[PDB]
Design a protein around this ligand. Structure first.
Ligand SMILES: [Cl-]
Length: 129
């Protein structure tokens, strides 16, 4: 599923991401835009052999099991394929664990490089929330 910008914002809000650990909703929408272009089916392979999955590009090195990243962890206790669903519940629940691990949203490279320190509220502007 390719979400619309406001559609995703409302889904994220419903799942408890607005101001989760101090990160306003705009931060999450901006991250999803630059990580996956709002596409739940996005995958990208990393140099170390791990793969990033889904709308928030969660990495199989630490967070999910894809059966092909030897010596990796599965801290979210889920198959990586679950992160590709049109239902974003699994991605959100795992993202909540990631953002709580001490490094905040800096875990997401595109957030650090393209959202951090910008006017992120622009990403939810005009949305019925
Ligand atoms: Cl933080």
């Amino acid at each position: 599923k390719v979400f619309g910008r406001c559609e995703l914002a409302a889904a994220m809000k419903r799942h408890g991401l607005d101001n989760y650990r101090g990160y306003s909703l705009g931060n999450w929408v901006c991250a999803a835009k630059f990580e996956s272009n709002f596409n739940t089916q996005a995958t990208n392979r990393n140099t170390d052999g791990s793969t990033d999955y889904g709308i928030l590009q969660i990495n199989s090195r630490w967070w999910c099991n894809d059966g092909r990243t030897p010596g990796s962890r599965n801290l979210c206790n889920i198959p990586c394929s679950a992160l590709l669903s049109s239902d974003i519940t699994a991605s959100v629940n795992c993202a909540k664990k990631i953002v709580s691990d001490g490094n905040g949203m800096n875990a997401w490279v595109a957030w650090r490089n393209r959202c951090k320190g910008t006017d992120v509220q622009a990403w939810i502007r005009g949305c019925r929330l």
